[PDB]
Amino acid sequence: GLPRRIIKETQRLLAEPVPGIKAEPDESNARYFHVVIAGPQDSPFEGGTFKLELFLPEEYPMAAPKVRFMTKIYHPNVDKLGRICLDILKDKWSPALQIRTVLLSIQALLSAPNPDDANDVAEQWKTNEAQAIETARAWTRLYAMN
Amino acid sequence: VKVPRNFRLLEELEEGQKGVGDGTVSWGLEDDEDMTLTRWTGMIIGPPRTNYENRIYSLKVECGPKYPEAPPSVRFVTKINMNGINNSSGMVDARSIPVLAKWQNSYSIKVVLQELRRLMMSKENMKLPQPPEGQTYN
């Protein structure tokens, strides 16, 4: 049976959305969510709209939700297949947390990136921040506007 | 539990990196930066006590936009004489391979490659004359 917790979280997402975030369940799959996060004001991603997908696996909420960026983005925490490096999506998940926490955390990651982890983009952000920010802006113009 | 394509193929990527125990089949992305997760490579070691024995077969597997609802496409790069494999293009005829002919959405790249390996084990294939080792299709 579909866990009551998933039904209630879905209702809550529809009734009280997170500002700057759209999140809707897939018509064919109640465990599958289509998410859009607006690029935060004053960040390198300002003006962009970023598509993500989220999936609630069998053992949710004991296991974390899985989340993938679908829109190409230049960010210390997002690898080349869109996988997100975020502690509460791995080690630090707990059933005390919920979908809304994950969505707010990703928005927060975009608003003010923190490059300490380890990968080429994080390294650029640490030692050549100006270029990293310009590249993130360029990719927002190129991939997050249409 | 239905796993949507974009998450299923990331699972299959991690499983392929982990590999099966004995290395008799393997799979991975053709381009490990391919966001669409569409084009994969496969590897089958020819089974023992057959005319395929010990030979390394390289394959190309395509997981289209409707995978895993729709079966993947499969092509041998290494030339192989085996029922269902076109002897000039290496393409695998889905009608000839039960796992593809009767595809179900719980199947996976691993399952397809293991099925092809089991089929090289069959009475109909195991004694088929084979081309000189190493040959490939145009």
UniProtKB/Swiss-Prot annotation, chain A:
Principal location class: nucleus
Regulation: Activity is inhibited by binding to OTUB1, which prevents 'Lys-63'-linked polyubiquitination. Activity is inhibited by GPS2, leading to prevent 'Lys-63'-linked polyubiquitination.
An example Gene Ontology biological process: protein polyubiquitination
Annotated ranges, domain UBC core: 1-145
Tagged with keyword Ribosomal protein: no
Record carries keyword Nucleotide-binding: yes
Localization in the cell: Nucleus; Cytoplasm
Impact when changing residue 90 to R: No ISGylation
Active site residues of this protein: 85
Recorded metabolic or biological pathway in which this protein acts: Protein modification; protein ubiquitination
Catalytic activity: S-ubiquitinyl-[E1 ubiquitin-activating enzyme]-L-cysteine + [E2 ubiquitin-conjugating enzyme]-L-cysteine = [E1 ubiquitin-activating enzyme]-L-cysteine + S-ubiquitinyl-[E2 ubiquitin-conjugating enzyme]-L-cysteine
SMART domains the record matches: UBCc
Keywords: Acetylation, ATP-binding, Cytoplasm, Disulfide bond, DNA damage, DNA repair, Isopeptide bond, Nucleotide-binding, Nucleus, Transferase, Ubl conjugation, Ubl conjugation pathway
GO cellular component labels: cytoplasm; cytosol; extracellular exosome; nucleoplasm; nucleus; protein-containing complex; UBC13-MMS2 complex; ubiquitin conjugating enzyme complex
CDD domains in the record: UBCc_UBE2N (cd23813)
Catalytic activity, EC: 2.3.2.23
Crosslink position(s): Glycyl lysine isopeptide (Lys-Gly) (interchain with G-Cter in ISG15): 90
MF terms in GO: ATP binding; RNA binding; ubiquitin binding; ubiquitin conjugating enzyme activity; ubiquitin protein ligase binding; ubiquitin-protein transferase activator activity; ubiquitin-protein transferase activity
Record-linked InterPro entries: UBQ-conjugat_E2_core, UBQ-conjugating_AS, UBQ-conjugating_enzyme/RWD
Modified residues (N6-acetyllysine): 80
PTM description: Conjugation to ISG15 impairs formation of the thioester bond with ubiquitin but not interaction with UBE2V2.
Quaternary structure (record): Heterodimer with UBE2V2. Interacts (UBE2V2-UBE2N heterodimer) with the E3 ligase STUB1 (via the U-box domain); the complex has a specific 'Lys-63'-linked polyubiquitination activity. Interacts with RNF8 and RNF168. Interacts with RNF11. Interacts with the E3 ligases, HLTF and SHPRH; the interactions promote the 'Lys-63'-linked polyubiquitination of PCNA upon genotoxic stress and lead to DNA repair. Interacts with ARIH2 (via RING-type 2). Interacts with OTUB1; leading to inhibit E2-conjugating activity. Interacts with GPS2; leading to inhibit E2-conjugating activity.
Protein role: The UBE2V1-UBE2N and UBE2V2-UBE2N heterodimers catalyze the synthesis of non-canonical 'Lys-63'-linked polyubiquitin chains. This type of polyubiquitination does not lead to protein degradation by the proteasome. Mediates transcriptional activation of target genes. Plays a role in the control of progress through the cell cycle and differentiation. Plays a role in the error-free DNA repair pathway and contributes to the survival of cells after DNA damage.
Recorded family membership: Belongs to the ubiquitin-conjugating enzyme family.
Name of this protein: Ubiquitin-conjugating enzyme E2 N
Species this chain originates from: Homo sapiens (Human)
Encoding gene, per UniProt annotation: UBE2N
Swiss-Prot record, chain B:
Cellular component GO terms, alphabetical: cytoplasm; extracellular exosome; nucleoplasm; nucleus; UBC13-MMS2 complex; ubiquitin conjugating enzyme complex
Domain of life: Eukaryota
A Pfam family that the UniProt record links to this protein: UQ_con
UniProt keyword terms in alphabetical order: Acetylation, Ubl conjugation pathway
Gene: UBE2V2
Domain UBC core: residue ranges: 4-138
Expression induction: Up-regulated in cultured fresh blood cells upon treatment with vitamin D3.
Protein's GO biological process: DNA double-strand break processing; error-free postreplication DNA repair; positive regulation of double-strand break repair; positive regulation of protein K63-linked ubiquitination; postreplication repair; protein K63-linked ubiquitination; protein polyubiquitination; protein ubiquitination
Function field: Has no ubiquitin ligase activity on its own. The UBE2V2/UBE2N heterodimer catalyzes the synthesis of non-canonical poly-ubiquitin chains that are linked through 'Lys-63'. This type of poly-ubiquitination does not lead to protein degradation by the proteasome. Mediates transcriptional activation of target genes. Plays a role in the control of progress through the cell cycle and differentiation. Plays a role in the error-free DNA repair pathway and contributes to the survival of cells after DNA damage.
Organism: Homo sapiens (Human)
Protein name stated in the entry: Ubiquitin-conjugating enzyme E2 variant 2
Subunit structure: Heterodimer with UBE2N. Binds CHFR.
InterPro entries, sorted: UBQ-conjugat_E2_core, UBQ-conjugating_enzyme/RWD
Tissue expression from the record: Detected in placenta, colon, liver and skin. Detected at very low levels in most tissues.
Family from the record: Belongs to the ubiquitin-conjugating enzyme family.
PROSITE patterns cross-referenced by the UniProt entry: UBC_2 (PS50127)
